[PDB]
Chains A and B, each alone.
Chain A
């Protein structure tokens, strides 16, 4: 159960990280024009 709660906490962190990266990429696109 302990390891399970750590696994799904990790997954939830990874997800957030991915979201940030995606958003960042969008911002970069704008910088490209610059």
Chain B
């Protein structure tokens, strides 16, 4: 779902660019200003990424913990299944 959303965003840009190009050709306003602002707002992320890296590490650790918990419950389930099988055999 996230991917589809991202694609939609990029799609707008692509189409937007095409429109701009055509617009310029014809010319040869507000939208332009808006675009400029967006531009000013990955490059910058570079320095910001430094921090993101630290936070990514934290959220990786959390995921690992969750995985462990899941494994625990999984083991219990397996044990239960085994017990059931044994009971059936006895019957």
Contact = CB atoms under 8 A, between A and B. Distances in A.
**In-complex A–B contact (CB below 8 Å):** yes
Task: Point out which of A3, A10, A32 has the most chain B C-beta atoms below 10 A from its C-beta.
Answer: A3
* Main SS class of interface, A: helix
Counting contact residues on chain B (CB < 8 A from A), the size range is: 20 to 34
Nearest to B12: A22
Counting contact residues on chain A (CB < 8 A from B), the size range is: 10 to 19
Contacts of A7: 48, 51-52, 55
Interface of B: 9, 12, 15-16, 19, 22-23, 30-31, 34-35, 37-38, 41, 44, 48, 50-52, 54-55
Interface of A: 3-4, 6-7, 10, 13-14, 17-18, 20-22, 24-25, 27-29, 32
**3 smallest beta-carbon distances between A and B, as pairs:** A3-B51, A24-B31, A17-B38
